[PDB]
Amino acid sequence: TDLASIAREKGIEFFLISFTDLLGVQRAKLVPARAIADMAVNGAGFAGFAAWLDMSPADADILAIPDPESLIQLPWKPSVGWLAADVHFEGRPFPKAPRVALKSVLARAAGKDMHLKHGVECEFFLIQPDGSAISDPADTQAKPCYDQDALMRRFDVIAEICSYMVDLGWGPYQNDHEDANGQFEMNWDYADALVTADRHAFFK
Amino acid sequence: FMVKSVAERHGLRATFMPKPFAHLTGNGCHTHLSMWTAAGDNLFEGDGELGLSPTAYAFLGGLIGHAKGLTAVVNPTVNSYKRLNAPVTVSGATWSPNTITYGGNNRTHMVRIPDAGRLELRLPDGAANPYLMPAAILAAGLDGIETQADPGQRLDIDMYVEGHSVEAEQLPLNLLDAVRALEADEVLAGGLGAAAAAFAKFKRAEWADYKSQLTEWERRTTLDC
Ligand SMILES: Nc1ncnc2c1ncn2[C@@H]1O[C@H](COP(=O)(O)OP(=O)(O)CP(=O)(O)O)[C@@H](O)[C@H]1O
């Protein structure tokens, strides 16, 4: 996959070359389109100790090699392209990196012709910017699950994200107000574990 | 009067309110009772279970038999019914009655038998009239004696826990039902004279006044109906 050509074709001006650390933190570097070909082949350098990877400030940089098939133009900002990456250290995948660790287990299972597929139901709350209370002061009842009123009160945000997921080809199919006040969930189709994992990281 | 007056002199205030705080134990007025001859003999003292006489058990039989109407008088306020049949408190027990039952040395019942020769009625609260309470208790107790009332079976269990696995009559759940019961109780009403009907009139009006008060709880739970 020719990221440089895609950038010109799709009008992508910056790429986020991203990896997930041991604490689930999304680590990313913002690279201008002019530099993507270099990063695609060689990876993007990061000081590994600065993320949750259990390294040393004395270690050589890790190189995050992007998976070109993971490319997502941010639906809310299409001029930026997100890529999930495998952390490499000293010329090979780094076993302490989550995505690398997953791919290792998947390869052992695949060797036995067993392929994991999964789907995730990622519940979340919508809260005030300061985090102190839910976003909807009118969502108060003891049993709020599937509350039509509170659900529609957040239609704009929920509908925007659902429609992004349609466009992204994830096959979204239901959006719910969940059992806690202020809590929601948006489902999408299961897939090969690696695909779902990347989608999961991006979704949040 | 003394307690209120003195508290006030100390910059404090005393209340005998039955249930002044939602999640805390309420104010009881536990009443210990026995009947004596003029010669000075305690008629409750006896050779029956727990050192009680048949007279004692009959008197109790009257308390049990007339419990619903008696509740109107010894639990005379709307608030009284938040002390009775209350949800468990922070301290782990309400220490008030829920059911028309009696035990031995057991504080989970309507009546407790603390020792030989007396009964503890745990039903009354701090709003109980100092004169009407003993009067209604006596009226009921006398009818029990006169009719040789059977109080039924003593329950040696914790009613708060091991009470759902037994047949026990529930106390009136509000002032309205208590007053309804007092009005239907010929012995109590008749025993108290014209006081009973006048008392019932006032308590009915109090209950109606209570009904008309709009509460914050109803607003929170009903505005979105
Ligand atoms: N054979 C399969 N293997 C793995 N995941 C699957 C699967 N079949 C369906 N899924 C996925 O599991 C997730 C949940 O599916 P579904 O909504 O049908 O279950 P459920 O109804 O118990 C969820 P909820 O309680 O929120 O409605 C979805 O992502 C779905 O794609």
Side-chain angles (χ1 to χ4, degrees):
Chain A
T1 295
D2 195 348
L3 295 178
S5 292
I6 301 183
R8 183 182 73 266
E9 297 166 351
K10 304 288 208 307
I12 300 178
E13 296 173 341
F14 298 87
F15 293 87
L16 282 177
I17 297 175
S18 172
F19 70 89
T20 299
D21 70 23
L22 254 0
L23 262 57
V25 186
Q26 302 298 283
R27 307 284 182 186
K29 177 186 305 290
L30 187 76
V31 311
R34 63 179 303 280
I36 195 55
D38 184 33
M39 306 284 81
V41 179
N42 299 310
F46 293 90
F49 177 83
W52 298 105
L53 291 175
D54 186 29
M55 304 185 72
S56 167
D59 290 332
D61 285 319
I62 65 183
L63 288 158
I65 299 179
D67 181 344
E69 305 309 307
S70 69
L71 179 64
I72 295 177
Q73 282 177 258
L74 308 187
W76 64 97
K77 190 185 300 300
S79 68
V80 167
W82 177 91
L83 295 148
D86 274 5
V87 167
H88 277 64
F89 179 61
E90 285 174 344
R92 62 195 69 86
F94 189 53
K96 284 174 187 193
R99 195 173 190 261
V100 169
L102 171 63
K103 305 215 306 189
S104 284
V105 189
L106 289 171
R108 295 197 291 274
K112 309 192 159 191
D113 196 24
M114 291 185 279
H115 301 268
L116 176 60
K117 301 197 180 190
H118 74 113
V120 289
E121 301 200 87
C122 305
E123 300 184 313
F124 60 90
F125 284 70
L126 295 173
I127 63 184
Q128 307 290 336
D130 71 20
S132 62
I134 62 168
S135 75
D136 180 3
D139 179 356
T140 56
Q141 69 186 129
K143 275 188 187 291
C145 207
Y146 320 119
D147 185 54
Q148 183 175 101
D149 289 330
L151 181 53
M152 281 304 293
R153 205 168 285 117
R154 290 291 169 266
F155 172 86
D156 295 341
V157 64
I158 291 316
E160 169 170 357
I161 296 163
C162 188
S163 296
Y164 289 162
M165 287 192 285
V166 171
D167 299 339
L168 286 171
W170 296 11
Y173 62 88
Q174 79 174 3
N175 309 285
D176 285 290
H177 189 306
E178 290 299 334
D179 182 63
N181 303 275
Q183 187 193 38
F184 297 85
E185 194 196 322
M186 307 176 60
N187 296 95
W188 74 88
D189 291 333
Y190 75 109
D192 288 307
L194 181 57
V195 174
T196 294
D198 286 349
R199 292 172 169 180
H200 185 176
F202 185 77
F203 180 73
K204 298 168 64 191
Chain B
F1 172 62
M2 170 160 57
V3 170
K4 297 169 177 172
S5 297
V6 170
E8 186 170 339
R9 294 167 59 87
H10 280 76
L12 308 166
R13 178 177 177 180
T15 187
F16 293 87
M17 183 170 177
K19 187 83 172 182
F21 301 102
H23 303 290
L24 301 182
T25 301
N27 284 143
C29 182
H30 310 143
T31 301
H32 294 248
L33 305 150
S34 56
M35 298 284 276
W36 298 66
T37 65
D41 180 42
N42 176 2
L43 295 171
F44 282 14
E45 200 91 52
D47 305 308
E49 288 256 357
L50 304 184
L52 290 184
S53 63
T55 291
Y57 282 112
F59 187 104
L60 179 52
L63 266 27
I64 293 284
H66 294 288
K68 303 186 298 299
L70 185 64
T71 302
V73 178
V74 309
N75 305 281
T77 72
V78 169
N79 180 248
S80 293
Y81 298 84
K82 300 179 163 39
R83 165 180 168 270
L84 302 177
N85 277 109
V88 70
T89 57
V90 293
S91 70
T94 62
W95 299 101
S96 61
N98 296 335
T99 56
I100 299 167
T101 51
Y102 76 101
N105 197 351
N106 184 329
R107 301 165 182 276
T108 76
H109 293 278
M110 191 187 84
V111 168
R112 156 171 173 257
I113 302 162
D115 199 10
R118 82 181 192 275
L119 297 174
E120 182 190 55
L121 189 65
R122 294 184 60 84
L123 183 61
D125 60 39
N129 194 292
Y131 305 94
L132 289 186
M133 160 183 65
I137 289 174
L138 187 49
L142 284 173
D143 183 70
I145 291 176
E146 169 69 9
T147 66
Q148 294 159 330
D150 179 16
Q153 169 139 161
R154 190 186 73 239
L155 272 13
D156 298 316
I157 71 189
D158 175 354
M159 205 65 27
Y160 302 136
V161 175
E162 192 162 357
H164 63 275
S165 241
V166 59
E167 167 68 298
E169 197 175 24
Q170 194 166 40
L171 288 164
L173 290 177
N174 56 62
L175 186 53
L176 177 62
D177 285 334
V179 171
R180 280 165 169 167
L182 201 210
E183 284 167 346
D185 195 317
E186 272 68 67
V187 159
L188 275 191
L192 293 164
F199 177 96
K201 173 157 56 176
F202 291 147
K203 271 54 186 71
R204 273 179 184 276
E206 294 175 19
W207 187 84
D209 192 12
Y210 168 67
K211 183 172 80 65
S212 76
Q213 309 297 316
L214 231 314
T215 64
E216 183 57 22
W217 176 88
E218 293 164 81
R219 290 190 88 60
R220 280 183 286 108
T221 66
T222 326
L223 269 173
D224 297 341
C225 75

mmCIF file of all heavy atoms in Angstrom, chain B residues 101-142:
data_model
loop_
_atom_site.group_PDB
_atom_site.id
_atom_site.type_symbol
_atom_site.label_atom_id
_atom_site.label_comp_id
_atom_site.label_asym_id
_atom_site.label_seq_id
_atom_site.Cartn_x
_atom_site.Cartn_y
_atom_site.Cartn_z
ATOM 1 N N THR B 101 -46.819 -9.339 67.626
ATOM 2 C CA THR B 101 -46.224 -10.561 68.140
ATOM 3 C C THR B 101 -45.564 -10.269 69.474
ATOM 4 O O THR B 101 -45.354 -9.095 69.831
ATOM 5 C CB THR B 101 -45.156 -11.097 67.167
ATOM 6 O OG1 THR B 101 -44.231 -10.049 66.837
ATOM 7 C CG2 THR B 101 -45.802 -11.614 65.890
ATOM 8 N N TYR B 102 -45.239 -11.326 70.213
ATOM 9 C CA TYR B 102 -44.485 -11.176 71.451
ATOM 10 C C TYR B 102 -43.364 -12.207 71.540
ATOM 11 O O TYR B 102 -43.415 -13.270 70.895
ATOM 12 C CB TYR B 102 -45.405 -11.241 72.681
ATOM 13 C CG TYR B 102 -45.888 -12.625 73.081
ATOM 14 C CD1 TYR B 102 -45.294 -13.308 74.135
ATOM 15 C CD2 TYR B 102 -46.967 -13.227 72.430
ATOM 16 C CE1 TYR B 102 -45.741 -14.568 74.521
ATOM 17 C CE2 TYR B 102 -47.424 -14.480 72.810
ATOM 18 C CZ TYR B 102 -46.810 -15.145 73.855
ATOM 19 O OH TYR B 102 -47.254 -16.395 74.234
ATOM 20 N N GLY B 103 -42.347 -11.876 72.330
ATOM 21 C CA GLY B 103 -41.205 -12.751 72.536
ATOM 22 C C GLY B 103 -40.881 -12.881 74.011
ATOM 23 O O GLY B 103 -41.656 -12.435 74.858
ATOM 24 N N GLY B 104 -39.754 -13.520 74.321
ATOM 25 C CA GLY B 104 -39.239 -13.533 75.678
ATOM 26 C C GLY B 104 -38.453 -12.255 75.911
ATOM 27 O O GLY B 104 -38.965 -11.159 75.667
ATOM 28 N N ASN B 105 -37.208 -12.396 76.364
ATOM 29 C CA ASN B 105 -36.323 -11.250 76.530
ATOM 30 C C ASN B 105 -35.726 -10.890 75.174
ATOM 31 O O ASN B 105 -34.572 -11.197 74.892
ATOM 32 C CB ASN B 105 -35.222 -11.548 77.545
ATOM 33 C CG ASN B 105 -34.555 -10.293 78.048
ATOM 34 O OD1 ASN B 105 -34.800 -9.204 77.530
ATOM 35 N ND2 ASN B 105 -33.704 -10.431 79.055
ATOM 36 N N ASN B 106 -36.539 -10.226 74.354
ATOM 37 C CA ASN B 106 -36.340 -10.141 72.915
ATOM 38 C C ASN B 106 -36.904 -8.801 72.451
ATOM 39 O O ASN B 106 -38.092 -8.549 72.588
ATOM 40 C CB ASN B 106 -37.114 -11.294 72.264
ATOM 41 C CG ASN B 106 -36.919 -11.395 70.752
ATOM 42 O OD1 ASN B 106 -36.713 -10.400 70.046
ATOM 43 N ND2 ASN B 106 -37.038 -12.620 70.242
ATOM 44 N N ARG B 107 -36.057 -7.948 71.892
ATOM 45 C CA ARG B 107 -36.474 -6.589 71.569
ATOM 46 C C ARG B 107 -36.927 -6.401 70.118
ATOM 47 O O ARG B 107 -36.991 -5.265 69.631
ATOM 48 C CB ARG B 107 -35.344 -5.610 71.919
ATOM 49 C CG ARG B 107 -34.944 -5.646 73.391
ATOM 50 C CD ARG B 107 -33.610 -4.945 73.639
ATOM 51 N NE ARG B 107 -33.222 -5.029 75.045
ATOM 52 C CZ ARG B 107 -33.654 -4.179 75.960
ATOM 53 N NH1 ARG B 107 -34.464 -3.205 75.584
ATOM 54 N NH2 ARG B 107 -33.291 -4.299 77.234
ATOM 55 N N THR B 108 -37.251 -7.495 69.429
ATOM 56 C CA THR B 108 -37.662 -7.393 68.027
ATOM 57 C C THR B 108 -39.179 -7.519 67.854
ATOM 58 O O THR B 108 -39.677 -7.543 66.736
ATOM 59 C CB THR B 108 -36.932 -8.422 67.108
ATOM 60 O OG1 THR B 108 -37.492 -9.729 67.290
ATOM 61 C CG2 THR B 108 -35.421 -8.460 67.404
ATOM 62 N N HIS B 109 -39.911 -7.586 68.965
ATOM 63 C CA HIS B 109 -41.360 -7.784 68.926
ATOM 64 C C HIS B 109 -42.179 -6.586 69.408
ATOM 65 O O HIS B 109 -41.629 -5.589 69.882
ATOM 66 C CB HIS B 109 -41.745 -9.013 69.752
ATOM 67 C CG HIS B 109 -41.256 -10.297 69.167
ATOM 68 N ND1 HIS B 109 -41.924 -10.952 68.155
ATOM 69 C CD2 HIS B 109 -40.149 -11.034 69.428
ATOM 70 C CE1 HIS B 109 -41.259 -12.047 67.831
ATOM 71 N NE2 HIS B 109 -40.172 -12.113 68.578
ATOM 72 N N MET B 110 -43.503 -6.698 69.285
ATOM 73 C CA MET B 110 -44.402 -5.685 69.818
ATOM 74 C C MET B 110 -44.366 -5.712 71.337
ATOM 75 O O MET B 110 -44.423 -4.675 71.990
ATOM 76 C CB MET B 110 -45.842 -5.909 69.342
ATOM 77 C CG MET B 110 -46.763 -4.718 69.669
ATOM 78 S SD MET B 110 -48.511 -5.013 69.320
ATOM 79 C CE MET B 110 -48.999 -5.863 70.829
ATOM 80 N N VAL B 111 -44.275 -6.913 71.898
ATOM 81 C CA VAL B 111 -44.187 -7.063 73.344
ATOM 82 C C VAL B 111 -42.965 -7.891 73.698
ATOM 83 O O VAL B 111 -42.646 -8.886 73.038
ATOM 84 C CB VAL B 111 -45.452 -7.730 73.950
ATOM 85 C CG1 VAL B 111 -45.208 -8.129 75.402
ATOM 86 C CG2 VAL B 111 -46.659 -6.797 73.853
ATOM 87 N N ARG B 112 -42.265 -7.457 74.735
ATOM 88 C CA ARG B 112 -41.118 -8.181 75.233
ATOM 89 C C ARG B 112 -41.419 -8.557 76.676
ATOM 90 O O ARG B 112 -42.060 -7.791 77.399
ATOM 91 C CB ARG B 112 -39.860 -7.303 75.129
ATOM 92 C CG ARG B 112 -38.738 -7.672 76.082
ATOM 93 C CD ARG B 112 -37.468 -6.892 75.761
ATOM 94 N NE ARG B 112 -36.431 -7.108 76.760
ATOM 95 C CZ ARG B 112 -36.114 -6.242 77.716
ATOM 96 N NH1 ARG B 112 -36.732 -5.066 77.797
ATOM 97 N NH2 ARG B 112 -35.151 -6.541 78.578
ATOM 98 N N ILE B 113 -41.001 -9.753 77.082
ATOM 99 C CA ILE B 113 -41.117 -10.153 78.478
ATOM 100 C C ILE B 113 -39.722 -10.101 79.075
ATOM 101 O O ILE B 113 -38.933 -11.029 78.896
ATOM 102 C CB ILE B 113 -41.685 -11.575 78.619
ATOM 103 C CG1 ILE B 113 -43.063 -11.667 77.954
ATOM 104 C CG2 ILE B 113 -41.762 -11.979 80.095
ATOM 105 C CD1 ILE B 113 -43.507 -13.102 77.664
ATOM 106 N N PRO B 114 -39.410 -9.004 79.775
ATOM 107 C CA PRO B 114 -38.032 -8.746 80.209
ATOM 108 C C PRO B 114 -37.633 -9.577 81.423
ATOM 109 O O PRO B 114 -36.455 -9.856 81.612
ATOM 110 C CB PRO B 114 -38.062 -7.260 80.580
ATOM 111 C CG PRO B 114 -39.460 -6.982 80.942
ATOM 112 C CD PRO B 114 -40.313 -7.882 80.085
ATOM 113 N N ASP B 115 -38.615 -9.968 82.230
ATOM 114 C CA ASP B 115 -38.351 -10.671 83.475
ATOM 115 C C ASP B 115 -39.693 -11.150 84.021
ATOM 116 O O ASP B 115 -40.738 -10.852 83.436
ATOM 117 C CB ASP B 115 -37.665 -9.721 84.463
ATOM 118 C CG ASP B 115 -36.939 -10.455 85.581
ATOM 119 O OD1 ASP B 115 -36.797 -11.694 85.499
ATOM 120 O OD2 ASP B 115 -36.501 -9.785 86.541
ATOM 121 N N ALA B 116 -39.677 -11.895 85.124
ATOM 122 C CA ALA B 116 -40.925 -12.342 85.741
ATOM 123 C C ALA B 116 -41.767 -11.156 86.225
ATOM 124 O O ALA B 116 -41.234 -10.150 86.694
ATOM 125 C CB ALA B 116 -40.643 -13.299 86.898
ATOM 126 N N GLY B 117 -43.084 -11.273 86.104
ATOM 127 C CA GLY B 117 -43.980 -10.317 86.727
ATOM 128 C C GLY B 117 -44.207 -8.985 86.024
ATOM 129 O O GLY B 117 -44.746 -8.058 86.638
ATOM 130 N N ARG B 118 -43.805 -8.871 84.759
ATOM 131 C CA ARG B 118 -44.151 -7.675 83.977
ATOM 132 C C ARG B 118 -44.004 -7.832 82.463
ATOM 133 O O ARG B 118 -43.298 -8.722 81.959
ATOM 134 C CB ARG B 118 -43.380 -6.443 84.460
ATOM 135 C CG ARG B 118 -41.967 -6.316 83.909
ATOM 136 C CD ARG B 118 -41.291 -5.074 84.476
ATOM 137 N NE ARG B 118 -40.045 -4.709 83.800
ATOM 138 C CZ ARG B 118 -38.850 -5.217 84.097
ATOM 139 N NH1 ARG B 118 -38.735 -6.138 85.038
ATOM 140 N NH2 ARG B 118 -37.767 -4.813 83.440
ATOM 141 N N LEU B 119 -44.707 -6.966 81.746
ATOM 142 C CA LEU B 119 -44.686 -6.941 80.292
ATOM 143 C C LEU B 119 -44.061 -5.618 79.844
ATOM 144 O O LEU B 119 -44.271 -4.593 80.492
ATOM 145 C CB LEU B 119 -46.119 -7.032 79.765
ATOM 146 C CG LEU B 119 -46.900 -8.313 80.085
ATOM 147 C CD1 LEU B 119 -48.346 -8.183 79.634
ATOM 148 C CD2 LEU B 119 -46.255 -9.525 79.423
ATOM 149 N N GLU B 120 -43.284 -5.640 78.759
ATOM 150 C CA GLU B 120 -42.838 -4.394 78.123
ATOM 151 C C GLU B 120 -43.532 -4.218 76.771
ATOM 152 O O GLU B 120 -43.262 -4.969 75.826
ATOM 153 C CB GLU B 120 -41.315 -4.382 77.919
ATOM 154 C CG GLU B 120 -40.802 -3.073 77.300
ATOM 155 C CD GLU B 120 -39.336 -3.113 76.853
ATOM 156 O OE1 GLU B 120 -38.966 -4.000 76.059
ATOM 157 O OE2 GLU B 120 -38.557 -2.226 77.276
ATOM 158 N N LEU B 121 -44.440 -3.251 76.675
ATOM 159 C CA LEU B 121 -45.011 -2.898 75.380
ATOM 160 C C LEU B 121 -44.047 -1.955 74.660
ATOM 161 O O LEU B 121 -43.822 -0.825 75.103
ATOM 162 C CB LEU B 121 -46.378 -2.229 75.534
ATOM 163 C CG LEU B 121 -47.155 -2.005 74.230
ATOM 164 C CD1 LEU B 121 -47.549 -3.335 73.572
ATOM 165 C CD2 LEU B 121 -48.396 -1.125 74.464
ATOM 166 N N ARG B 122 -43.479 -2.418 73.553
ATOM 167 C CA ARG B 122 -42.457 -1.643 72.838
ATOM 168 C C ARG B 122 -43.088 -0.810 71.733
ATOM 169 O O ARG B 122 -42.396 -0.105 70.988
ATOM 170 C CB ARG B 122 -41.398 -2.586 72.239
ATOM 171 C CG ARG B 122 -40.573 -3.322 73.305
ATOM 172 C CD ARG B 122 -39.459 -4.174 72.690
ATOM 173 N NE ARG B 122 -38.518 -3.370 71.909
ATOM 174 C CZ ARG B 122 -37.492 -2.709 72.435
ATOM 175 N NH1 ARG B 122 -37.274 -2.744 73.746
ATOM 176 N NH2 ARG B 122 -36.682 -2.008 71.651
ATOM 177 N N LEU B 123 -44.408 -0.905 71.627
ATOM 178 C CA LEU B 123 -45.155 -0.262 70.547
ATOM 179 C C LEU B 123 -45.156 1.286 70.623
ATOM 180 O O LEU B 123 -44.974 1.954 69.601
ATOM 181 C CB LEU B 123 -46.599 -0.801 70.519
ATOM 182 C CG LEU B 123 -47.522 -0.304 69.398
ATOM 183 C CD1 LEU B 123 -46.963 -0.692 68.028
ATOM 184 C CD2 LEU B 123 -48.947 -0.854 69.581
ATOM 185 N N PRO B 124 -45.359 1.858 71.823
ATOM 186 C CA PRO B 124 -45.516 3.322 71.869
ATOM 187 C C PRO B 124 -44.265 4.072 71.434
ATOM 188 O O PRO B 124 -43.147 3.573 71.584
ATOM 189 C CB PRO B 124 -45.803 3.610 73.356
ATOM 190 C CG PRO B 124 -46.328 2.319 73.904
ATOM 191 C CD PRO B 124 -45.521 1.257 73.162
ATOM 192 N N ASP B 125 -44.466 5.273 70.894
ATOM 193 C CA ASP B 125 -43.350 6.159 70.583
ATOM 194 C C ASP B 125 -43.393 7.413 71.467
ATOM 195 O O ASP B 125 -44.252 7.541 72.349
ATOM 196 C CB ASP B 125 -43.342 6.524 69.092
ATOM 197 C CG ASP B 125 -44.614 7.235 68.653
ATOM 198 O OD1 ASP B 125 -45.138 8.071 69.425
ATOM 199 O OD2 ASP B 125 -45.077 6.964 67.523
ATOM 200 N N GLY B 126 -42.466 8.330 71.218
ATOM 201 C CA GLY B 126 -42.328 9.518 72.035
ATOM 202 C C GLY B 126 -43.467 10.520 71.924
ATOM 203 O O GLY B 126 -43.543 11.442 72.725
ATOM 204 N N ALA B 127 -44.346 10.353 70.939
ATOM 205 C CA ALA B 127 -45.520 11.216 70.827
ATOM 206 C C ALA B 127 -46.723 10.694 71.624
ATOM 207 O O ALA B 127 -47.718 11.395 71.764
ATOM 208 C CB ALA B 127 -45.895 11.423 69.364
ATOM 209 N N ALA B 128 -46.635 9.465 72.139
ATOM 210 C CA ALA B 128 -47.750 8.878 72.891
ATOM 211 C C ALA B 128 -48.165 9.755 74.081
ATOM 212 O O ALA B 128 -47.328 10.179 74.881
ATOM 213 C CB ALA B 128 -47.410 7.472 73.365
ATOM 214 N N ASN B 129 -49.461 10.015 74.187
ATOM 215 C CA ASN B 129 -50.026 10.801 75.285
ATOM 216 C C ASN B 129 -49.768 10.114 76.629
ATOM 217 O O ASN B 129 -50.103 8.949 76.799
ATOM 218 C CB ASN B 129 -51.525 10.941 75.060
ATOM 219 C CG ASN B 129 -52.171 12.003 75.936
ATOM 220 O OD1 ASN B 129 -52.264 11.854 77.156
ATOM 221 N ND2 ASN B 129 -52.654 13.071 75.307
ATOM 222 N N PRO B 130 -49.170 10.834 77.586
ATOM 223 C CA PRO B 130 -48.868 10.240 78.894
ATOM 224 C C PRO B 130 -50.106 9.670 79.602
ATOM 225 O O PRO B 130 -49.941 8.754 80.411
ATOM 226 C CB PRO B 130 -48.297 11.413 79.692
ATOM 227 C CG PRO B 130 -47.758 12.351 78.639
ATOM 228 C CD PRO B 130 -48.734 12.240 77.504
ATOM 229 N N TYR B 131 -51.299 10.191 79.310
ATOM 230 C CA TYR B 131 -52.532 9.700 79.945
ATOM 231 C C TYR B 131 -53.323 8.746 79.048
ATOM 232 O O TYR B 131 -53.755 7.678 79.495
ATOM 233 C CB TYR B 131 -53.417 10.861 80.426
ATOM 234 C CG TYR B 131 -52.702 11.814 81.354
ATOM 235 C CD1 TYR B 131 -52.091 12.966 80.861
ATOM 236 C CD2 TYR B 131 -52.620 11.560 82.726
ATOM 237 C CE1 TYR B 131 -51.420 13.836 81.705
ATOM 238 C CE2 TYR B 131 -51.954 12.424 83.571
ATOM 239 C CZ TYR B 131 -51.354 13.566 83.054
ATOM 240 O OH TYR B 131 -50.683 14.443 83.884
ATOM 241 N N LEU B 132 -53.485 9.098 77.777
ATOM 242 C CA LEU B 132 -54.186 8.207 76.847
ATOM 243 C C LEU B 132 -53.499 6.863 76.649
ATOM 244 O O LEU B 132 -54.172 5.844 76.468
ATOM 245 C CB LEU B 132 -54.380 8.863 75.484
ATOM 246 C CG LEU B 132 -55.404 9.995 75.433
ATOM 247 C CD1 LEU B 132 -55.603 10.453 73.988
ATOM 248 C CD2 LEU B 132 -56.726 9.544 76.049
ATOM 249 N N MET B 133 -52.169 6.853 76.669
ATOM 250 C CA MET B 133 -51.427 5.599 76.427
ATOM 251 C C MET B 133 -51.721 4.544 77.496
ATOM 252 O O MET B 133 -52.195 3.460 77.175
ATOM 253 C CB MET B 133 -49.915 5.846 76.264
ATOM 254 C CG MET B 133 -49.012 4.584 76.498
ATOM 255 S SD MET B 133 -47.257 4.985 76.385
ATOM 256 C CE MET B 133 -47.053 6.073 77.795
ATOM 257 N N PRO B 134 -51.457 4.863 78.772
ATOM 258 C CA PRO B 134 -51.804 3.917 79.840
ATOM 259 C C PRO B 134 -53.286 3.564 79.810
ATOM 260 O O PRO B 134 -53.622 2.402 80.060
ATOM 261 C CB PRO B 134 -51.494 4.689 81.133
ATOM 262 C CG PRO B 134 -50.657 5.831 80.737
ATOM 263 C CD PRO B 134 -50.863 6.108 79.284
ATOM 264 N N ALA B 135 -54.152 4.539 79.514
ATOM 265 C CA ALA B 135 -55.595 4.278 79.451
ATOM 266 C C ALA B 135 -55.976 3.223 78.418
ATOM 267 O O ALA B 135 -56.763 2.319 78.711
ATOM 268 C CB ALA B 135 -56.400 5.587 79.209
ATOM 269 N N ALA B 136 -55.439 3.340 77.203
ATOM 270 C CA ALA B 136 -55.801 2.413 76.131
ATOM 271 C C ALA B 136 -55.174 1.036 76.367
ATOM 272 O O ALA B 136 -55.788 0.000 76.097
ATOM 273 C CB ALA B 136 -55.388 2.978 74.762
ATOM 274 N N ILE B 137 -53.948 1.038 76.876
ATOM 275 C CA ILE B 137 -53.275 -0.201 77.251
ATOM 276 C C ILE B 137 -54.099 -0.946 78.308
ATOM 277 O O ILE B 137 -54.379 -2.144 78.176
ATOM 278 C CB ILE B 137 -51.851 0.095 77.775
ATOM 279 C CG1 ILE B 137 -50.937 0.541 76.632
ATOM 280 C CG2 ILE B 137 -51.249 -1.122 78.442
ATOM 281 C CD1 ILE B 137 -49.535 0.992 77.115
ATOM 282 N N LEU B 138 -54.510 -0.227 79.347
ATOM 283 C CA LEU B 138 -55.316 -0.820 80.410
ATOM 284 C C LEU B 138 -56.652 -1.344 79.891
ATOM 285 O O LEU B 138 -57.065 -2.452 80.242
ATOM 286 C CB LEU B 138 -55.558 0.186 81.531
ATOM 287 C CG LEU B 138 -56.251 -0.376 82.776
ATOM 288 C CD1 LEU B 138 -55.589 -1.662 83.256
ATOM 289 C CD2 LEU B 138 -56.262 0.653 83.885
ATOM 290 N N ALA B 139 -57.327 -0.558 79.054
ATOM 291 C CA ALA B 139 -58.610 -0.991 78.490
ATOM 292 C C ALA B 139 -58.465 -2.311 77.742
ATOM 293 O O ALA B 139 -59.269 -3.235 77.909
ATOM 294 C CB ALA B 139 -59.197 0.084 77.567
ATOM 295 N N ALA B 140 -57.442 -2.390 76.903
ATOM 296 C CA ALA B 140 -57.166 -3.593 76.131
ATOM 297 C C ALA B 140 -56.823 -4.753 77.061
ATOM 298 O O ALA B 140 -57.343 -5.853 76.903
ATOM 299 C CB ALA B 140 -56.027 -3.337 75.154
ATOM 300 N N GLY B 141 -55.966 -4.487 78.043
ATOM 301 C CA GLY B 141 -55.463 -5.522 78.928
ATOM 302 C C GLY B 141 -56.578 -6.113 79.766
ATOM 303 O O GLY B 141 -56.638 -7.326 79.968
ATOM 304 N N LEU B 142 -57.457 -5.240 80.253
ATOM 305 C CA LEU B 142 -58.634 -5.647 81.011
ATOM 306 C C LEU B 142 -59.551 -6.535 80.185
ATOM 307 O O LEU B 142 -60.032 -7.559 80.670
ATOM 308 C CB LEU B 142 -59.403 -4.421 81.486
ATOM 309 C CG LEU B 142 -58.789 -3.691 82.675
ATOM 310 C CD1 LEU B 142 -59.543 -2.395 82.957
ATOM 311 C CD2 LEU B 142 -58.783 -4.600 83.896
#
